[PDB]
Amino acid sequence: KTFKQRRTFEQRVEDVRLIREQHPTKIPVIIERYKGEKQLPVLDKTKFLVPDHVNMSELIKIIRRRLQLNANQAFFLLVNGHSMVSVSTPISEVYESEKDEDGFLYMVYASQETF
Numbered sequence: 511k512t513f514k515q516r517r518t519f520e521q522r523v524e525d526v527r528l529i530r531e532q533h534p535t536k537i538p539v540i541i542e543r544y545k546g547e548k549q550l551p552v553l554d555k556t557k558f559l560v561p562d563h564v565n566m567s568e569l570i571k572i573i574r575r576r577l578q579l580n581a582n583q584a585f586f587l588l589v590n591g592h593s594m595v596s597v598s599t600p601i602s603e604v605y606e607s608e609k610d611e612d613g614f615l616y617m618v619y620a621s622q623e624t625f
């Protein structure tokens with residue numbers, strides 16, 4: 511079901527290395543619906559190449575646009591298993607501290623602050 515389940519650590523690492531080679535300016539992001547989520551839809555894909563200059567505030571706007579949400583639907587985004595300390599941080603900076611050992615940045619979204 512989940513990304514880490516579908517691919518070996520060997521496969522996730524080699525993929526990140528290919529994104530480095532072929533999309534050197536992109537952050538490799540895994541974005542997944544909270545497995546308890548009732549309200550929000552599932553995304554059409556799992557793996558996203560985010561321009562390394564966008565801040566977390568703008569990435570939330572992008573995901574809300576992809577899910578085609580309206581203005582009073584709630585959306586909460588976890589990074590590497592925990593709340594974001596700030597939405598103003600560039601994703602280049604968030605990647606360097608919150609990245610996984612396979613080299614992906616893992617995100618999970620839900621309609622409640624309680625995941």
Ligand SMILES: N#Cc1n[nH]c2ccccc12
Nearest residue numbers: 558559560561572573576
């Ligand atoms: N970069 C980029 C994105 N392309 N499509 C998206 C959907 C949600 C969040 C980010 C992106």
Ligand SMILES: [Cl-]
Nearest residue numbers: 533534535536
């Ligand atoms: Cl690139």
